[PDB]
A paper describes a structure:
VCCN1 was recently identified as a voltage-gated chloride channel residing in the thylakoid membrane, where it plays a key role in photoreaction tuning to avoid the generation of reactive oxygen species (ROS). VCCN1 structurally resembles its animal homolog, bestrophin, a Ca2+-gated anion channel. However, unlike bestrophin channels, VCCN1 lacks the Ca2+-binding motif but instead contains an N-terminal charged helix that is anchored to the lipid membrane through an additional amphipathic helix. MdVCCN1 forms a symmetric homopentamer, with each subunit consisting of three domains: transmembrane domain (TMD), N-terminal domain (NTD), and stromal domain (SMD).
Residue numbers in the entry:
A (entry chain A), B (entry chain A), C (entry chain A), D (entry chain A), E (entry chain A): 84 to 419
The structure:
């Protein structure tokens, strides 16, 4: 049997297969294609290849089968085939015209709640990447002692490694031992691997490196006040992945949807007979789609493009280390 | 009599029994189950085991009984059994089709107001746990004097004890003497027990420990500027548990709901006769459910999973104290 | 005449009498009663004792009298009593079915605007009370010189007096000379009384006390950076009480309501005859109630429970001063 | 001709005449009058004296004339006066019953967008006035040297002058040479007058005054960190007056309104004949009014009462300078 | 063929041609014209010259052609021209009257999501320009050594160059080598040109200039704490241009729109015959317009007027450098 727990398992397999897809940062050409006139034709032709439509098949099939049974029973009562003790399963649409606004508002507000979490995650990552950039810039400008060349090089290696370590902590199946192969030294990477909380371990490396630096006390206090950003980022990411939206607030939306779609063929039979099947199909493909988008967007980190966000910090620190000698030579030639 | 103050007392007993339920942080597998295709069937089969549906029985029963009396009186006036001086209790639906949007918007906005408080509580806890982590990291990195080993150990014990003490202050029936058994020393725990404001007492311990530390004045000022986070967290939690949403804003929603559900059988009699009973049942189970979710989510701390949030800080400080010697040995071998 | 400026004056007298009502912080038992099943019956039986319903009588009576005149004129044109030159005052409901959403959205958005101001006031007070707590804690921990015992005692007296002084500034009829009797000394209270801006005067006392303290310059700069919170709190409270929501944004809502309720009997006459009186009554009691809640919640400080918020700071500083000797004795016994 | 560019010019003249109206801060009595029962009668009787209703005449007259032409043509086709080749200009209301929600939501959301800008401006001013108060308080408490009496007096004169200078920069026709007559000295005011950016010039005065003050370096750094508030305030005000809401987002609302009101008589003719004129009148007076309120509130500074906000800072600094000797004498008598 | 990929390519060419349009800051006269009575006539006459209407032709033409085919087939089935096996393609409007609210809310919420990004971009730029102003003011006031005249002049040149460099990074086709011709020296501009991340390079110049300045350590730490604003601004701009709104959240809106507009002639045929063509035209020109505005506003930087925002900082630093001697001479004459 196709409906006997086969469609829902295939839907889940495909949905989890689509979660681990490579994302890239938008540049200007992608934005041109996004704003283009062909966008509507594109989105149409891209369905049956998207997570949201492929994960929507079970509900829509279930609610179309119910409408076919309602229709085939009301059609059996008329032009009667069965004993006259069975009534027509029909009703008035007036009760559901006074409640449609409530269901519409509840679905749209739940989707907005989910988008809020998406935005929170994006901002948290924005502040982490900005802070890693600013800390690395300050370390390059501040650390000047010839005797602390070795520790500075290590100190800039642990900053670039922090966004990667945090990205491996919030993404289900990633290998931190492969992403940090070329960043950390062989002996420092084993200390990170033995730790249960890898980003916490890299923070401890950075904090201990800043103590052994022969800086003035004022400058050391200034430098070590930038670590608080990494703590805040770790916190926000852990809470966004640990603490979902209220389950009451979500089961409400689910229960209301199922009840509305079960009795919708009964209120619509009186005016459109046998047209309730496509009406139920369209209602189930629209209202359930709105809920599904919100469910997918809610743990936000699988759809954020963190690899290019980490690569940006890596590239920026490499560029800043390469451009040091030219800038120092240009600023040395001021009045001489 | 089942309706004579029996259902509302059983509903309250069950509702308060469900408030004190153990919550856990979501990991990745829980998120897989949450996003799955079987979610709708699950939420259906989980009803009659949830707070929101079990606390919804009194209103829905009350408003279905009213509809049965309206119906059984209108049915008595037709095919008359009674003197002809009694009129039919019927009306037009047109007045309620111009006001449905207002009730829908008012209910959904009240629920969003409640979710705002839920989010405020979650963020407050996020900042408290992040700050406890950051303070503990800085104390481990900064305190280096051999003569202050004893006070440092105590200083890290009062940081881990702060989130627990704050969690026992915002949760109705918890024993702080059992949660802090293995964290604080026997003599320091009695000073916390005799205090009316336990988190305030632990803050006073931390502040006094930071004065007796033989630190430089700049470093002491840097360290003691991290205590402000704990004050802010205490404040926000106390205000969220002390100051609810305006009672005007809540009694409005309640009064409007009761009035709409009392007269709903009268406006719906003219088109659906005797179908007003199930219509009233569905309207009362949907509109009252939306309000109930909002009432439950509004004091937010019973549904936040604070035990795993405190355990995280405990584990992190233990891991950081265990990994100190390896990190110091690795950073010592830079140029030697 | 009852309607000749008698009902509106009694309504105003009662409304202003209900503004000055004692509020208490919610504890856990109050929250139990709030979430209970009996809440709906309670809110019903509590009407005719609430500000919002007693201040709603004039509009609802005015709009019910209009409907009675419309009805008694349409009933006079039919079964004619009058010359045939007078037409029936009836219309179509179709124009008002395309505009109902706009009025619903405008009323609900105005109420949300008002709740935003309520939340702003609550947060402002949260930050003021948290800052007073944190400043007092730091003064207790930092000030250690035996020669500055007298000034420290005064310095902690002006912190506790600040929330009270600010509460008397934002509450219409309060006596600051009675609330500060037991807090300030007899000579310092006369300097506060002669000032036009009392919270500003207490801030000047705190700032001058921090200069005469024989502290190190770093520690004095740290201590006097906490006064900025009190300035910010004063600012926000003054702006919330001085600058209301745009009068355009409010007169719009009022004008739209009055116009909709004047012509509502004319559009509803064609389907429900003489049932327009109760329909007008219900519409005026619902739509006007939504607006009234928003008007009451808008200057937010009369409904915030500031006395218990100030008493909290008083109690906390007393408890911290009493627990000093035990904490110092416990921390002295670390390695000796 | 009254309609030939006469009504729109008179409307603009009156609208710009009403922009430059004196505003005062609300005290408690004004709040009593605002919350009163007579408010609805007041707002009614105040129309034909308000900006929003007087600037609404052109659109409402234009759309009522269109409805009169539609009606007088449909009435000419019936009881025919003209050749039978002209059809009746009638339609079905069903298309506009599925789109009314969209127009309602778009208008209300645009008005909320405008109120957001109003709130941004109010908060920006709140932070500027609070910061000017806090800077002035700190300068009074900190500057103690007898040799810097002359510069301190000037330093407090430039703080009070800053809110006035910023208010003259964001208000169209104000004279800064008259508002600063009694605040600045005759020679310092000419340097401000010759500058293109007056608030920027006063900031440069304050910054240069803080360098010539014989303060300790820590205290000078603390004092000059308060200037950043004035920069932030200048920025926010300039951006709010320079960068309006997207013109796409505004022309959409305008175009949709004009199209809906042009064809509204055609869809409403089929049920109400000749009643489309008042229906069009009411729709144009309600929907256009909602848009107009939003247009007026959008550059927010003409309706904020900045003169009383500046006068507050002036009064507070005068009061603090007058109360210095009493506070110093009271604090001197602590143990002596 | 006009419809064979000709209209969509011309629409895209025109749309991208309109993206690169010069924007200016609003002054007071522009605000007068914006609030004027003639605004509605203006917006009407300005269509067929706007991006949003010219990019709306393909969808509206496509959905009007569908309605013409539906109409010309239903008209062929009636007054039959074809074999009687073909049914009438008609339906009931009742299913779409219960779903209209959902589509309205989804479109308006997506447009609000886009406006949120517009506001984020505006605020980010506000903070960058304010910070550049404040840093430049502090450098002018602080740097006093005669031997560091040459480096100060350069230091003020790199601050003014930062907003320009950031503007060339977020705007598709701009020449940074032409915008910085008169700002930077010939040798310093080549170091900026060779860099992949130009704003990052200018930040490295500023940081290295602040190290070679013979300042006190406290003052150097104060000055170099202002660079963090430029990092935060770079971050926010890069994330706003790299990370768009969820594609699920956007393809949902597109798919729902296309499905609603394809079947709209079928539900509207039963009451308005052949009037479905203009109804489809109006629905497609309104609902698609709302979506298009949101798509255009979403990457926010092409419609922000950044050239006048950079020119403001340039002018302000020139004015502050010119007014230094007058202010110093005025403040020198205090007691002498």
């Amino acid at each position: 049997i196709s409906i006997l727990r086969i469609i829902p398992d295939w839907s889940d397999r495909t949905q989890e297969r689509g979660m681990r897809q490579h994302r890239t940062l938008y540049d200007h050409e992608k934005w041109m294609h996004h704003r283009s006139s062909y966008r509507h034709l594109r989105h149409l032709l891209s369905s049956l290849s998207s997570r949201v439509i492929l994960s929507l098949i079970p509900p829509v099939i279930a609610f179309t089968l119910v409408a076919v049974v309602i229709a085939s029973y009301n059609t059996a009562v008329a032009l009667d085939l069965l004993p006259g003790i069975f009534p027509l399963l029909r009703s008035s649409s007036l009760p559901y015209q006074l409640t449609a606004p409530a269901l519409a508002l509840l679905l749209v507000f739940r989707t907005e709640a989910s988008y809020s979490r998406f935005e929170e995650g994006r901002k948290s990552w924005t502040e982490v990447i900005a802070g890693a950039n600013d800390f690395a810039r300050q370390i390059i400008s501040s650390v000047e002692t010839s005797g602390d060349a070795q520790l500075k090089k290590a100190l800039l290696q642990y900053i670039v490694a922090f966004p990667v370590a945090l990205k491996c902590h919030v993404i289900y199946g990633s290998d931190i031992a492969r992403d940090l192969q070329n960043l950390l030294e062989v002996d420092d990477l084993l200390v990170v691997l033995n730790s249960k909380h890898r980003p916490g371990c890299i923070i401890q490396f950075i904090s201990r490196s800043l103590q052994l630096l022969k800086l003035e006390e004022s400058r050391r206090i200034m430098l070590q006040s930038k670590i608080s950003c990494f703590h805040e980022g770790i916190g926000i990411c852990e809470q966004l992945i640990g603490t979902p939206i209220p389950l009451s607030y979500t089961r409400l939306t689910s229960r209301f949807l199922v009840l509305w779609h079960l009795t919708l063929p009964i209120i619509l039979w009186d005016d459109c007979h046998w047209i309730v099947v496509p009406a139920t199909f369209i209602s189930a493909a629209s209202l359930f789609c709105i809920e599904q988008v919100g469910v997918l967007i809610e743990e936000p980190f699988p759809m954020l493009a963190l690899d290019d966000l980490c690569n940006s910090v890596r590239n920026n620190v490499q560029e800043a280390l390469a451009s040091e000698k030219l800038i120092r030579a240009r600023l040395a030639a001021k009045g001489r």
